[PDB]
């Protein structure tokens, strides 16, 4: 896979080659793959490979990454959330 | 996503933003997402976003979280379990 | 399971008994199992047991393994990737 505009990766704290879960709001499909960085500013969200069977151009999806940490740190942990609208306009 | 009454999260030892598995007893669907806290005493169990394709109001579900620990600790580990009935009445 | 030519495992850095994700490019199925080593040079990719319900001889698949590491190490991490063509000819 899933090429994502590098600006999006930076905002959500997601790294290239990191595991990500993709939950499809449009068709309800949920799958896991890994992140690839796409050119900055392109606003690209490309589902490549076998994953092309789970999402179509135009589908709304939620992409998430998970990390592990000691319970004491988890208590105050805060995730990096980026919101979008229109044609991948980061609001 | 799944907003869960903070009291329920407290009883099960589940943290906000922690990854959770939801197993639908009603329809048999099994999915993973993360927990969000709902105001205490609200008794809310809300499946939002893409998750709304896997559960409906009225469905009976089991919500579980998993943690990692060394083998010795694992052998003496006791899970935090809460049982429900009726109008999400804890026992 | 999935017996994989030991040479292929070597190129991808995959270990025997290591958990692997198999993404079927042909039918779109995605499943997880563990790797078994097949004799070197055999070029075997065998889906055995319950896995045989997700892949058939002839199917094109992507086999991946994931590891965990601290954030600093993650940012400089480079995956071991092997590409194939024809009769499972590595490039």
């Amino acid at each position: 896979x899933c090429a994502i505009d590098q600006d999006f990766l930076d905002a959500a704290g997601i790294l290239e080659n990191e595991a990500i879960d993709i939950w499809n709001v449009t068709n309800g499909k949920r799958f896991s793959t890994y992140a690839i960085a796409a050119e900055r500013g392109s606003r690209i969200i490309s589902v490549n490979g076998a994953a092309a069977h789970c999402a179509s151009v135009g589908d709304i999806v939620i992409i998430a990454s998970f990390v592990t940490m000691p319970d004491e740190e988890a208590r105050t942990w805060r995730p990096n959330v980026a919101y979008f609208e229109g044609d991948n306009e980061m609001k | 996503x799944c907003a869960i009454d903070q009291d329920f999260l407290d009883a099960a030892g589940i943290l906000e933003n922690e990854a959770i598995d939801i197993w639908n007893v009603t329809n048999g669907k099994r999915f993973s997402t993360y927990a969000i806290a709902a105001e205490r005493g609200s008794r809310i169990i809300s499946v939002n976003g893409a998750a709304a394709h896997c559960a409906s109001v009225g469905d009976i579900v089991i919500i579980a979280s998993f943690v990692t620990m060394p083998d010795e600790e694992a052998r003496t580990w006791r899970p935090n379990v809460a049982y429900f009935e009726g109008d999400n009445e804890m026992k | 399971x999935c017996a994989i030519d030991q040479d292929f495992l070597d190129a991808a850095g995959i270990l025997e008994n290591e958990a692997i994700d198999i993404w079927n490019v042909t039918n779109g199925k995605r499943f997880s199992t563990y790797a078994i080593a097949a004799e070197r040079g055999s070029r075997i990719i065998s889906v055995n047991g319950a896995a045989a319900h997700c892949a058939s001889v002839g199917d094109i698949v992507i086999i991946a393994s994931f590891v965990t590491m601290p954030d600093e190490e993650a940012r400089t991490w480079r995956p071991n990737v092997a590409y194939f063509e024809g009769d499972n000819e590595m490039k």
Binding site: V47, M69 | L15, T68 | -
Partner: peptide, 24 residues
């Protein structure tokens, strides 16, 4: 014990391209 937490997420992005034959 170690917890698995949400690191971050891109909420409601649109798939712009799908390439089944991708080899990279």
């Amino acid at each position: 014990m170690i917890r698995t937490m949400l690191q971050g997420k891109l909420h409601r992005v649109k798939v712009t391209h799908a390439d089944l034959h991708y080899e990279g």
